[PDB]
From Swiss-Prot, chains A, C, D, E:
The organism of origin for this protein: Photobacterium phosphoreum
Pathway this chain belongs to: Lipid metabolism; fatty acid reduction for biolumincescence
Molecular function GO labels: acyl-CoA dehydrogenase activity; long-chain-fatty-acyl-CoA reductase activity
Family: Belongs to the LuxC family.
CDD domains linked: ALDH_Acyl-CoA-Red_LuxC
Chemical reaction(s) catalysed: a long-chain fatty aldehyde + NADP(+) + CoA = a long-chain fatty acyl-CoA + NADPH + H(+)
Alphabetical keyword list: Luminescence, NADP, Oxidoreductase
Protein name per the record: Long-chain acyl-protein thioester reductase
Origin organism lineage: Bacteria, Pseudomonadati, Pseudomonadota, Gammaproteobacteria, Vibrionales
EC number: 1.2.1.50
């Protein structure tokens, strides 16, 4: 009986006469309105004139982040309550999600440097820059469509922020599991300034894959770029229901791992690995699933990791763990005990550590389970690193990442981090081997005339004059 | 007594003459709010001696030595320092109503010079 | 009865027992072998270890270009003969195509600067660069698949070169109209050095869309990136027959135009516009189709353009113009004469100039036809510029491009050139609003540890320590 | 009877037995110790091992700035009291100086971007970067000597900060007018962390030009780079008493001006011009001395500027204005009234506005005096812009700076700002036509071997092999 | 009786009535005209309007280089004859000097990349670039004065080229040993195009240090930047006779060394070390004087180096070696034989190899002498590396430079090369720890207005508004 609004232009639509559907997120019903033809027409007719510079955009995002920073912000309190109630989060994890929203919105240098590292300059989105033999400007694609996944709210938040930094209009289809984060972010934009071009560029809605396709297809046809986030079938749907001349940013399902080389300081190593296992309840694509221990004291590291997992049992507890998830946890613990895998678990099935031999049968629930293997050398880990599947290859003593990053990259790593940092996509890097807002941008080139020669020929480019005289190969360097 | 009356007499006669026959001095006194008829000698405007190099200006009981404040450019009491203004009335060539580069004290009239400005 | 080879590893396959198909390119038969299962297995098993630096790659390409620079190069002579015979090119246009191959292969600074402008540094493909808070390396995607279009051979050549500069393996499916350019380029690589990693990375073949899909689908499944070049159905096929987690570089069909503002020097203006109309027989995506004249002497420009088109009638003649194309030319000339459109044409229907009013009915064959319109202001041209259709917005007095580039970019220009330069995609710019080898590359990020703080917080990133102490919002800026 | 300490290593020297000298700054005596031979030996023997990265340096500076941000910081209170007492500042101006110290120390992105814009990357001071055909690292020069001027404390603060960001050791000779700012900054470093390499790199002292030269010459001989800030004789002394193989950064005396083109919003224009006239009591090199008004309402702007100067009379009052300065003010007001120059002044001779014709005789005291001229076109202002004398060419409607910056640069502008910004040397720009920490750095080049060819030759550089074969000109491009 | 001309504007001056002086370069007399007051006035009045872009400048230099590339170029033949006759060069070395002039003039990418690496962009000399919070343009200083040394003609050539690339006017004072190179280069500019702004920017002349100082001082006063190249007294003269507000680029005397770590391929190692010893007759600042051998076969390397020096005895012979130089060679060979230093020499005293122990007494003539020492570890070489004296620290197996470059930089290396490359100042690096055309340029900054906030504050910079409200520390980050 809790109703979720629909934002289209820069404000909630009058969904009184709309049709509603419930979802049953965490054993609790939530009514979302069904999009109709008038909403599709309102989306088609949306054209926001965005003349802000990157300074103004970043300052608006900073203002919104400062609004999210106050614990008394009504929208933040409501968002935390909904994370706890309908996503099953613990109060600590919900507070942490709200805090991370505030943090990534309030970090101005981070946004400036995102634009700089991905596009080359933070000014290329507002000025014609003389890159070489040309003047280049990064224009938006417009009406960017974002299809969200559901596990990590920060994924959708960062997607929307990336689209905003490139002056794109956002049509956000929320996931069937987290219909609250995008609504909260857009309503926060509205609360900050309802007449801002950024607030008027947000359109948050929801449609399922089981319903009639007419209206979602009409919405997809006005995209100019699509950002898909879900698993395999989500990306397949995005590929099948996108105009063939429109680009798709695909953020598929991944499987991240951890490498522990030979830590002299085992306690920080265990702290980091436990952080990576426990953050977001191991539901993210950067969450550690398998640990590969090199060295001579795998059992000392096992004990220290058990201690750190017990700490995370208290400072960041689990979700709500529906019946089937509990049964899965128990049956998989039985499976691993039946194979002498040195199983250990926490109270109320909070976590699971399994020391199986390399290459062994192990069933993986993503509750907080982790399989640790003794490998004895990096050459035995690389057969378990795939091209487009392994995303984060966490290395625990960070120095040891300097002697492994080359072979991990050769085998498809896409990321190498320090084990306490798997959730932080540090500025200047990449996401899934891809700098995302290079694809949210249209590079418009203003090429300079024939009197400006190239760096190799030193001859004015008069193609007609030299077609008359029959002179081409005398100029070829 | 009558020495003061002497200098008062010929100094206002000098001021009237130089105000009537020199238009840059007349415009200078009208930039100061000074009329044909002024009674006392301290209501007379005085320009600096740096002028004598910028524009070419041409029309003892007879010199009114005075120690002026640097802000108000009004006379100070005798014994304290200040800018030396002269008000010579011997001249008919140029209005010798000037202020020096010199700081000094004046004692009842002998005039002392302590230092220059800079 | 002329046979086209099939290159797979770095050499021609023994296609003696293969099945062949003829194509009838220019009223002349050409046998191409049909790919079988053994060829698919050879393609799957192809793994070339490429440890060259960008210096070595560019130097190899320069050597190949110097080989193409000699007019006595047997492969170049054969390629020119095939362009003349099977593509219908005139000897001048075929020689010009070979010369442009040589030119773009021998321009080393151009390739270095392509890598630099698109990826940020020419060293990012071999070294870990400290972009910001990270070390980034540009790795190849591997086994890049290139589906070629057929109009412009240089398009396929540049595609292959872009894939080579990023250390990608190339599986080139040639077009049904130009099955010679990719074969000639790969065989030239082989002639230069058959044991080079670049020569061993080329696999040129052909399959149609009317045949059984098993083998082409098997070839498409080992792609890791796809580059499609054709029209609408070609890109639709590429989208439908690509693994959903694989990226596609789409180079769709475009419609380029020209703007003549008010040239005091009308002769160079006409020279440029004629160049853009006549190059590649107006079959390229950057070829000028509609001219928009501003000013007061549209008829003087008309006469000068007629003179320059008559010059191009001799210095760069047309193709062979099959019966239906001749009939189309004649019937369209009749259509335009029936509407008082001030039609003018060249001898042997070499070109066609039509002065129709703005927004008028005009049938467009791409033989050498051009429609010129009087507009009187730029605001009347922008309604005829679409988002993903208008590619090149040639402006004839190049100075006038400085006061139009902003509104042209706002309306979807993607390129602004000087009218003698529509065929030259100058270095430092973009192709279809896209810097292509940003998508032929996997950005691999090695993020630096928690002791390296961000630019906004100045606090070491110890997330566990601050989850214990319950300290997050005191650090948010 | 107030004693000023002497810092040499990272702490105050035991100057009990030293010889002292008084200075009489603002009619108040201040004892500074005279440097002796033991202090010179301590300076010579100072070698601090600085292994911090730019992240650590900027974070330490941020910590010091946060310390300066607290109004209860004892050292800040003492510094403000000394600015008021011995420099004659008003409490507002002293508080503003302390606040600007805090601001420039706490702006982390500003420091990062200084390093990035001047050296090319913020990492070039810690890593070998592949610029081109080389690996470059920016090393410090070491034992940088800073001779300060006295007018603007922020000048010395920024000089020291620039030297710190490049990992230089600082030997600061304070001016005979401001012996407090460098001492306060170094003692603040000490208060933050006395064992930090940055705190141990500061050596603040004082010597006059009238004393024996033995000890100051010994101090100057261990410089490796010199930064001089004073007027003409100060720079002459620096040039004469520096080892001939050591570089000198010269910040000479300047004369900045303002240009008011034709403001529709005269009030903000007057606000800005008044700010530039009144900041630092018009004693800085970026302070506006002459205003050049274009337009038709010079008297309206005159009145509005009078109002804004009256506002600054209250929100940022003058210094203490010794007897001779008062007499100068009065005599110069008389001089300007004697020439019908439309003189206006503030109460207690707070400011002076003089509307003289262009090119006229006007005596300029730097109290708060400003001469405004009607010019009617920019071509009449350029004869009054010299090469190494005009530093800031403030333009009041900032848009009008886009049509003047080229001729101002051609005539030696070195800066063009917005009239409310003359004191802010914005990040990314330059100081006196010079990016200063390009000269505080030694660029160390590690050139890559002969197997790495150049971009023009494509031949391995085997000079012996080709001297044998007598082959040079066949490779020249 | 051979007369050397004087170029002032862009052509030779009528020196008929001038006074002449002879020099006796290589036992041969050469008359150079003495500068008089009219020449000084012509130099003062020289103001060339230089509106070329970097493309045009580089293309002109390329044309001049192509002119120098022809062996039949009369000016090149005359220059080689004068190098042989008056500098004592061997025909091979003179031909090599002319070839290197041609090479560095014809390498266009090298010049473009010099500008790019040193200034940040090759366009910053013609366009206002948005670096950060500013628009920066690199303007020339104008009337650059170059005082040349005499050993290496390429030094003066590169100096002039650097000044040209920055659009500076060149006043070249030739050395008393090489008065031919600058004259040849300027006359070549004239021969290419006498009306070009680059040809009209050259003024080549000569004055001694023993003559009256009036005219050379008048010439030095119109400098705006000075580039000094000689030894100690030359730089001292430059420092003493330059206006105190003018910058000086000092290229002092250096002492370069070589490190041979443990070459498995001793032959290429010896080839490189011999190249570095023998190029320019060991008279350059990058010439190897001391060799430091690590390893176990110092005598095998000794023999191989003897063989390579015997090869260079033939492929690049010595100069003419005046009587005193011969006597020095013999007496120093006697000195080294008297200390069991394992002396070896070539025929006609062509070279000298001396194997003395580390730290030993050894007299160094720069004829072709080299002292080789056994060190056994890098830690024993670093005490012999000074700050501003050691320029090139040649490392023979280039891989070993990766484990030594850090300590060599810490001890003042300024360059690390591959032993066959000491004469090639590779693009992208530095010269004497200094990127020279950063100092030949005036960085002119156009700072953007108060509405453009900084990256740290996010508040419009209204200093008056906040001085009224008394708000500063709430904005400090």
């Amino acid at each position: 009986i809790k109703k979720i609004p629909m934002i289209i232009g820069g404000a909630e639509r009058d969904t009184s006469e709309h049709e509603y559907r419930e979802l049953t997120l965490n054993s609790y019903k939530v009514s979302i309105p069904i999009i109709n033809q008038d909403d599709v027409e309102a989306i088609k007719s949306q054209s926001v004139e965005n003349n802000l510079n990157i300074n103004q955009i970043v300052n608006f995002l900073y203002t919104v982040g400062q609004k999210w920073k106050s614990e008394n912000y009504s929208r933040r309190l409501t968002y935390i309550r909904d994370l706890v109630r309908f996503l099953g989060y613990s109060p600590e994890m919900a507070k942490l999600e709200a805090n991370w929203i505030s943090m990534i919105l309030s970090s101005k240098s981070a946004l400036y440097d995102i634009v700089e590292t991905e596009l080359g300059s933070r000014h290329i989105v507002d000025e014609w820059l003389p890159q070489g033999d040309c003047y280049v400007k990064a224009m938006p694609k417009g009406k960017s469509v974002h299809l969200l996944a559901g596990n990590v709210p920060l994924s959708g938040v960062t997607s929307i922020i990336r689209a905003i930094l490139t002056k794109n209009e956002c049509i956000i289809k929320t996931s069937s599991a987290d219909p609250f984060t995008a609504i909260a972010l857009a309503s926060s934009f509205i609360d900050t300034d309802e007449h801002h071009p950024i607030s008027r560029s947000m359109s948050v809605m929801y449609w399922s894959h089981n319903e009639d396709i007419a209206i979602p297809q009409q919405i997809m046809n006005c995209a100019d770029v699509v950002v898909s986030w879900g698993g395999y079938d989500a990306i397949k749907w995005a590929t099948e229901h996108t105009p063939v001349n429109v680009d798709i940013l695909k953020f598929g399902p991944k499987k991240s791992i951890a490498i522990v080389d030979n830590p002299v300081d085992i306690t920080a190593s265990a702290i980091g690995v436990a952080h990576d296992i426990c953050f977001y309840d191991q539901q993210a694509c950067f969450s550690t699933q398998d640990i590969y221990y090199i060295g001579d004291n795998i059992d000392a590291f096992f004990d220290e990791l058990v201690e750190q997992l017990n700490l995370y049992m208290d400072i960041l507890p689990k979700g709500d763990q529906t019946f089937d998830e509990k049964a899965s946890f128990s049956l998989i613990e039985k499976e691993c005990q039946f194979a002498k895998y040195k199983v250990e678990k926490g109270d109320n099935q909070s976590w699971l550590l399994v020391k199986s031999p390399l290459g062994s049968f192990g069933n993986q629930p993503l509750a907080r389970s982790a399989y640790i293997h003794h490998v004895s050398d990096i050459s035995e880990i690389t057969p378990y690193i795939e091209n487009r599947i392994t995303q984060t290859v966490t290395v625990t003593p960070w120095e040891s990442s300097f002697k492994y990053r080359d072979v991990l990259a050769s085998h498809g790593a896409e990321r190498i981090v320090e084990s306490g940092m798997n959730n932080i996509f540090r500025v200047g890097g990449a996401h899934d081997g891809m700098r995302p807002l290079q694809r949210l941008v249209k590079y418009i080139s203003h090429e300079r005339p024939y009197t400006y020669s190239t760096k190799d020929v030193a001859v004015k480019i008069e193609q007609t004059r030299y077609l008359e005289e029959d002179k081409f190969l005398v100029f070829v360097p | 007594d009558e020495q003061e009356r002497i200098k008062h007499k010929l100094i206002l006669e000098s001021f009237r003459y130089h105000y009537n026959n020199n238009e840059d001095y007349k415009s200078f006194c009208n930039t100061q709010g000074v009329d044909e008829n002024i009674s006392s000698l301290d209501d007379i405007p005085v320009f600096p001696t740096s002028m004598f190099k910028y524009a070419k200006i041409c029309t003892p009981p007879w010199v009114y030595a005075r120690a002026l404040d640097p802000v108000t450019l009004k006379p100070v009491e005798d014994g304290q320092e200040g800018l030396i203004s002269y008000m010579d009335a011997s001249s008919t060539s140029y209005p010798t109503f000037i202020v020096t580069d010199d700081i000094g004290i004046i004692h009842t009239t002998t005039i002392d010079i302590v230092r220059r400005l800079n």
